[PDB]
Ligand binder design. Structure first.
Ligand SMILES: C[C@]1(c2cc(NC(=O)c3ccc(C#N)cn3)ccc2F)N=C(N)OC[C@@H]1F
Ligand code: NA
Ligand code: NA
Length: 379
């Protein structure tokens, strides 16, 4: 408990491409890099020679592979994959020292799924069976891990943004990964890691929206999404106060819609004209909340692949949603995030590694008094 040196620094990534962990599947073990995703629930790996893939799972080489004789077809909003279900022995080399028999979807066809130039070739869905494909009887990896071993039913994520890195602590919390105190918000329902946002401030100014709007139709914590996505009506209001707060420069409207980059002369980004964003989350106690605050260092993402520009270019990375609030890598990179499944709660603490400056830092502060927090949840 509290100290897991072998697991610190076990994540890697490139900006724009997510955070992956090394895993092994089958006997003898095949090493694969696997995207860590708290917004889905299937363990799914490339299992054929798609040109974008460095490595893929070769079931024929594994003596402990068992076929389930069932296909799975998984379309997303963007992209899809299709695959064949089975089980096999799975370990995490920089993880707990155990091996478990997990479901694996061997991906045999995909579209707009793998990223060309990325270093990962599957996904580890860490959310709950309720959203597993094809249905909730396909037990997710972390459920198998907890059933089969003595690993405590929790994991924690420290995502360090821009090469990126971080730590996934499986079965525990490592106190060297955060400063000050953890504050917990209840998991409203076990499917996604769904939470409830009770108030939103831009530079300390309240948006003053009916709080149910913040959670329409849910709010989730998702390591497999880069952006902070906000429900359309909330995004319109939040961009409007952000534009106002940042008045002392003017940008094309396109910038705010993520339709254009903005660039500055290297080493001169004026962070200070951009406001901080705070989300108050439902706390553990009736009428009690806490707040997390992120910086423009989190929501202005650097874009390297600008082979038609010389300078320091950024994407505005808060965007409108039709799926509810998504607290993606934009939120998570400020924090050490504890997925405390055993107590159905998610903890946040200021990350010991988040990107900040001399004037402002990401922050997790409480308690605050907030009434009618149960009305904020959408039904
Ligand atoms: C399974 C799914 C998914 C995620 C990804 N995720 C990614 O490419 C990706 C990229 C950058 C960052 C960051 N920072 C996180 N993830 C790719 C394909 C997918 F297919 N997971 C989530 N959470 O959202 C969309 C999709 F459902
Ligand atoms: Na157990
Ligand atoms: Na600490």
């Amino acid at each position: 408990r509290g100290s897991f040196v072998e697991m610190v620094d076990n994540l890697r990534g490139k900006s724009g491409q997510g955070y992956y962990v090394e895993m092994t599947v089958g006997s003898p073990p095949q090493t694969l890099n696997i995207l860590v995703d708290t917004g889905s629930s299937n363990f799914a790996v490339g299992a054929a020679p798609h040109p974008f893939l460095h490595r893929y799972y070769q079931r024929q080489l594994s003596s402990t592979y068992r076929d389930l004789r069932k296909g799975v077809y998984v379309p997303y909003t963007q992209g899809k994959w299709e695959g064949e279900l089975g089980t096999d022995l799975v370990s995490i080399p920089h993880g707990p020292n155990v091996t478990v028999r997990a479901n694996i979807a061997a991906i045999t066809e995909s579209d707009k799924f793998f990223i060309n130039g990325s270093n990962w070739e599957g996904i580890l869905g860490l959310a709950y069976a309720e959203i597993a494909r094809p249905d909730d009887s396909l037990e997710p990896f972390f459920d198998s891990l907890v059933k089969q071993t003595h690993v405590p039913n929790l994991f924690s994520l420290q995502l360090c943004g821009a090469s990126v890195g971080g730590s996934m602590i499986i079965g525990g919390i490592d106190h060297s990964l955060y400063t000050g105190s953890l504050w917990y918000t209840p998991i409203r329902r076990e499917w996604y890691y769904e939470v409830i946002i009770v108030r939103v401030e831009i530079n300390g100014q309240d948006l003053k929206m009916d709080c149910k709007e913040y959670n329409y139709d849910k709010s989730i914590v998702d390591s497999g999404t880069t952006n902070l996505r906000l429900p359309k009506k909330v995004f319109e209001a939040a961009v409007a106060s952000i534009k106002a707060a940042s008045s002392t420069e003017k940008f094309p409207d396109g910038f705010w819609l993520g339709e254009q980059l903005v660039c500055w002369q290297a080493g001169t980004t004026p962070w200070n004209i951009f406001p901080v964003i705070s989300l108050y989350l439902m706390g553990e106690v009736t009428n009690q909340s806490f707040r997390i605050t992120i910086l423009p260092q989190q929501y202005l993402r650097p874009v390297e692949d600008v082979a038609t520009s010389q300078d320091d270019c950024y994407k505005f990375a808060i965007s409108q949603s039709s799926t509810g609030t998504v607290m993606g890598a934009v939120i998570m990179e400020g924090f050490y995030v504890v997925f405390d499944r055993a107590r159905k709660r998610i903890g946040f603490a200021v990350s010991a590694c988040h990107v900040h400056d001399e004037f402002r830092t990401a922050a997790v502060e409480g308690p605050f008094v907030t009434l009618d927090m149960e009305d904020c949840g959408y039904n």
